[PDB]
């Protein structure tokens, strides 16, 4: 049996999101890609470096917004610009989010030497695709 | 076929223009041109910056 | 298979399509109208309306082919037919008028009558009962009876020939020697039938 990225069946009481519900073979069929860069296109270089930056950027955002992320972040690179699109729960006060955006943007712009912007869409609670 | 004088002297005239090796060089001695025309493996950014 | 089960085997008979409508039996007439609403398989690469195409010989060519080398197998069969025609022409010219009548110079007719002479009516299927090997008389279908004749010929020539002889020269010498009911392949057929007689009692098992 295949155990990869499959949120296994419980007893109908586990709330899975749309992204979690779909197994790897549904990538490019029902669900898209969380990161979009040009480094895996044919005849393009720097796939290794773009992928390493993504791994870090996901661990950074989880720790910087602990318990406030409703779903996985979406990374969008255009030219040298990096854009982080995160669904965040409305737990923290509004002014605290302005602090973490100013901090996380400046810190990651001086670390990777690119303009980095953070885009946050606030949800009242995690969105449940189905109960499995 | 063999290369007559006209053919050989034209080939040297071409090499002189295109900055190619002009003399008769053995295959062994052509590696010197390769070594100094190509970035060494240890100087390529993939090797020395392999790791984060 | 890449053909859905609804596909129909193609019919490559030139005369059949051009026959007058009244000459066709109503059963055949029905199939033509039905096939108009069916899917037809594409014809094979070796399926043509040629008047020189013989299915029996075409099958014999495929049973000699090795590793998909059809050009070589067809060449060997073509050389065989020629080697049989040239062997009968020599005999015909070097024979009296009375003898000349009997001599057959058609290689296609010597090939068909040779194979038929090597086809065994009954067979033997080896069985194991009680820790021994009891082979028992069996009856063979029209497909199994024809396959055995062709297989026995292609195996006598492949193996029991001198090292420097070639297949067009051993096969030609066997089609003609079988065509007269005296070859070793005919003996293989005779041995099959004689064993079946011996095992008449063991047919029950």
């Amino acid at each position: 049996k295949n155990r990869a990225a499959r949120v296994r069946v419980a007893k109908g009481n586990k709330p899975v999101s749309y992204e979690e519900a779909h197994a790897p073979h549904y990538i490019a069929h029902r669900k898209g890609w969380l990161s979009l860069h040009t480094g895996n296109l044919d005849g393009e270089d720097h796939a290794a470096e773009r992928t390493l930056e993504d791994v870090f950027l996901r661990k950074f955002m989880m720790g910087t917004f602990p318990g406030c992320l409703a779903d996985q972040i979406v990374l969008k690179r255009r030219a040298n610009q990096v854009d982080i699109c995160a669904l965040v729960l409305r737990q923290l006060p509004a002014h605290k989010f302005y602090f973490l955006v100013g901090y996380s943007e400046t810190l990651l712009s001086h670390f990777y030497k690119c303009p980095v912007r953070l885009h946050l869409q606030t949800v009242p609670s995690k969105v449940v695709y189905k109960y499995i | 076929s063999p290369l007559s004088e006209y053919a050989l002297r034209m080939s040297r005239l071409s090499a002189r223009i295109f900055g190619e090796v002009a003399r008769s060089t053995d295959s062994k001695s052509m590696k010197v041109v390769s070594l100094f025309s190509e970035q060494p493996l240890a100087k390529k950014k993939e090797t020395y910056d392999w790791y984060p | 298979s890449r053909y859905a089960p609804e596909f129909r085997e193609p019919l490559i008979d030139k005369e059949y399509y051009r026959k007058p409508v009244a000459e066709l039996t109503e059963e055949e007439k029905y199939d033509q109208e039905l096939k108009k609403t069916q899917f037809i398989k594409a014809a094979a690469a070796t399926e043509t309306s040629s008047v020189f195409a013989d299915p029996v010989i075409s099958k014999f060519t495929n049973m000699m082919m090795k590793g998909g080398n059809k050009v070589l197998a067809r060449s060997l069969m073509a050389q065989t037919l020629e080697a049989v025609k040239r062997k009968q022409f020599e005999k015909y010219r070097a024979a009296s008028a009375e003898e000349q009548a009997t001599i057959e110079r058609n290689p296609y007719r010597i090939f068909h009558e040779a194979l038929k002479n090597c086809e065994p009516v009954i067979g033997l299927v080896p069985i194991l009962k009680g820790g021994h090997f009891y082979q028992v008389p069996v009856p063979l279908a029209d497909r199994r009876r024809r396959f055995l004749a062709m297989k026995w010929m292609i195996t006598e020539c492949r193996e029991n020939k001198p090292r420097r002889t070639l297949m067009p020269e051993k096969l030609s010498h066997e089609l003609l020697e079988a065509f007269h009911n005296r070859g070793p392949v005919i003996k293989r057929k005779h041995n099959m039938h004689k064993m079946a007689e011996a095992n008449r009692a063991l047919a029950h098992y």
Binding site: - | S1, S4, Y6, A7 | -
Partner: protein, 80 residues
């Protein structure tokens, strides 16, 4: 040398020598006094043969171009 040249030049070639030698043997058999080189290679017969060989060498060789060459040889060699 001739091999180096990319476009055939009938003048001062193996063809011109072979043609001139044949025409010299032809006039000698006729019992005529030995003729000049320019005389033999100025005739119209030799003019046409030059054009046909050049076409074969440069324009390209084909059954059509070889047929034209066949006629020039017949005129040059006085063949029926």
């Amino acid at each position: 040398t001739e091999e180096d040249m990319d476009e055939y030049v009938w003048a001062k070639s193996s063809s011109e020598n072979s043609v001139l030698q044949t025409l010299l043997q032809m006039r000698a058999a006729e019992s005529s006094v030995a003729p000049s080189r320019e005389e033999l290679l100025g005739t119209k017969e030799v003019e046409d043969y030059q054009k046909c060989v050049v076409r074969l060498k440069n324009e390209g060789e084909n059954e059509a171009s070889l047929a034209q060459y066949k006629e020039s040889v017949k005129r040059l060699l006085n063949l029926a």
